[PDB]
């Protein structure tokens, strides 16, 4: 059924699974018209499909042309997400196909179930975790490839860089979720923490800086401070 704090180690076992997050599929700017009406302009979006064990990220870029002439876009976006996830699964070799897909929002359940009818043995699950994957577009290299796209495109990343050489996938996911939660709560301060020291760079083939084990501990503490700082600034504590 649903994925929560009680069954958390299941994410890191050897059954292939994917998280699917549709937050950033349909993105708009809201603006006034010349007559004082309100109108939206779409910008490019993305499906965030992540294997939490391996870090493999299947970033399907959603180009604004896919919305042209369509109605009820927020509803369409869920079905388009499910179509593209289904197409990804069919594109993978059988031994690489997931045994479970976990959607971060419950409104993706029926669209994805319907698109995956041909895969009755792939479990479609919700989660009670509030995962910060919407902040994926605060990762500069991901935002850059989405905004530059001129047509639909899939780009593959490892969202853990080389961390699994040194830490477990449980610890890697914890680091990722902490980084993303910080970027979601205060993007400016989080990015300041991550780059303040010019001697630590981001490798061309990486998303995050090349921190030593000790520097990651400092960074992680600074992110937890940020999240608690904002939690106080918010609630006045």
């Amino acid at each position: 059924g649903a994925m929560n704090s009680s069954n958390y180690a299941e994410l890191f076992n050897n059954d292939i699974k994917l998280f699917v997050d549709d937050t950033n599929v349909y993105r708009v700017t809201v603006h006034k018209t010349f007559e004082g009406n309100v109108a939206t302009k779409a910008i490019n979006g993305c499906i965030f499909t992540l294997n939490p064990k391996t870090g493999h990220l299947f970033l399907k870029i959603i180009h604004t042309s896919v919305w042209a002439g369509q109605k009820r876009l927020s509803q369409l976006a869920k079905w388009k997400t499910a179509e593209e996830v289904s197409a990804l699964v069919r594109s993978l070799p059988k031994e690489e196909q997931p045994k479970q897909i976990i959607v971060t929002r419950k409104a993706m359940l029926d669209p994805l179930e319907v698109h995956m009818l041909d895969f009755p043995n792939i479990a479609i699950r919700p989660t009670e975790l509030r995962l910060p994957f919407s902040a994926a577009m605060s990762i500069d290299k991901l935002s850059d490839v989405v905004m530059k796209a001129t047509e639909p495109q899939m780009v593959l990343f490892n969202i853990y860089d080389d961390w699994l050489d040194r830490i477990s996938s449980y610890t890697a996911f914890s680091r990722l979720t902490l980084l993303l939660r910080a970027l979601k709560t205060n993007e400016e301060s989080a990015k300041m923490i991550l780059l303040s020291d010019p001697t630590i760079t981001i490798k061309s083939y990486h998303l995050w800086p090349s921190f030593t084990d000790e520097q990651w501990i400092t960074i992680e503490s600074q992110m937890r401070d940020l999240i608690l700082t904002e939690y106080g600034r918010k609630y006045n504590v």
């Binding site: 079905w79 669209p111 319907v114 698109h115 009818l117």
Partner: protein, 300 residues
């Protein structure tokens, strides 16, 4: 006008005939039901006084044979049987009528209720849902499960309603996933009406039979089927005008007949609120909507 005689009434029982019912006391001199209107299916049903568990009964059509009821003390129920000897049967009935040991089917002349509830119900279709080919009549009870229920366990005792499943390959054309899920017209009109039922009369007959088994026996799988068949129509943007007109009449009389005190268990809030207020056909069911709002406003 036809007759279903009873050999005897050895156990206290509430006996239903269609929407009517009467209590018979243990060993009371009851010998059957006369003046049964020809032209409709009928159902004669039972609830024992000492174990209200298991309502059960028999669907029949007196045009198809001479039928009677006889209690079986081994299996512990009132059984329907066919009498093949016509002169024997006529002589039994005439004796029981002369001794006035029969109740009369108590139909008010103005009253079209039973017609309205069974308009599209045919015995030949009942006998395909309820498979027991050696009898001309069909047994149904409170506990019998449907084919669909069994899939999710004795198959000879199942209700073989047509399986409807909105998240199934049958319902969803590859490549029309969103379209077919949000507008079920292809599933209704091509798969079900053209494909399986052949016409709307047979679809309505199964819908009406499902409702009647839900109401008379408390059969839960029948209630599921009745609601699935309503929801499939209401969730279709493209429905022939005659079916919308006919569905409003069918449901109106079903809601009218339902015991007020069984609404909590026989009516699915989600289905009815969706059908009346959210679906494509939300403004195509005026009579059903008016009686529902005046009789069961809580549910809504």
């Amino acid at each position: 006008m036809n007759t279903v005689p009873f050999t005897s009434a050895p156990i206290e029982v509430t006996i239903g005939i269609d929407q009517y019912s009467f209590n018979v006391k243990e060993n009371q001199p009851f010998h059957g039901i006369k003046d049964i209107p020809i032209g409709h299916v009928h159902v004669i049903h039972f609830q024992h006084a000492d174990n209200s568990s298991m309502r059960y009964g028999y669907w029949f059509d007196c045009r198809m044979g001479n039928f009677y009821i006889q209690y079986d003390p081994k299996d512990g129920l009132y059984k329907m049987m066919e009498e093949r000897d016509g002169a024997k049967f006529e002589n039994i009935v005439h004796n029981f009528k002369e001794r006035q040991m029969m109740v009369s089917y108590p139909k008010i002349d103005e009253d079209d209720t039973w017609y309205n509830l069974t308009e599209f119900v045919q015995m030949d279709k009942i006998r395909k849902i309820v498979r027991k080919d050696e009898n001309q009549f069909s047994y149904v009870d409170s506990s019998m499960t449907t084919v669909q229920e069994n899939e999710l366990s004795d198959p000879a005792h199942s209700l073989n309603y047509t399986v409807i499943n909105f998240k199934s390959r049958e319902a969803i054309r590859p490549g029309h996933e969103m379209e077919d899920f949000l507008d079920k017209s292809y599933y209704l009109n091509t798969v079900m009406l053209q494909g399986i039922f052949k016409n709307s009369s047979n679809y309505f007959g199964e819908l009406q039979f499902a409702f009647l088994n839900a109401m008379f026996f408390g059969n839960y799988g029948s209630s599921l089927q009745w609601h699935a068949m309503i929801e499939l129509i209401c969730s279709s943007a493209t429905v022939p005008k005659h079916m919308l007109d006919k569905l409003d009449e069918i449901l109106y009389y079903q809601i009218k007949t339902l015991p007020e005190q069984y609404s909590d268990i026989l009516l699915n809030e989600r289905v009815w609120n969706i059908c009346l207020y959210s679906s494509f056909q939300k403004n195509s069911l005026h009579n059903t909507e008016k009686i529902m709002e005046n009789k069961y406003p809580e549910l809504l």
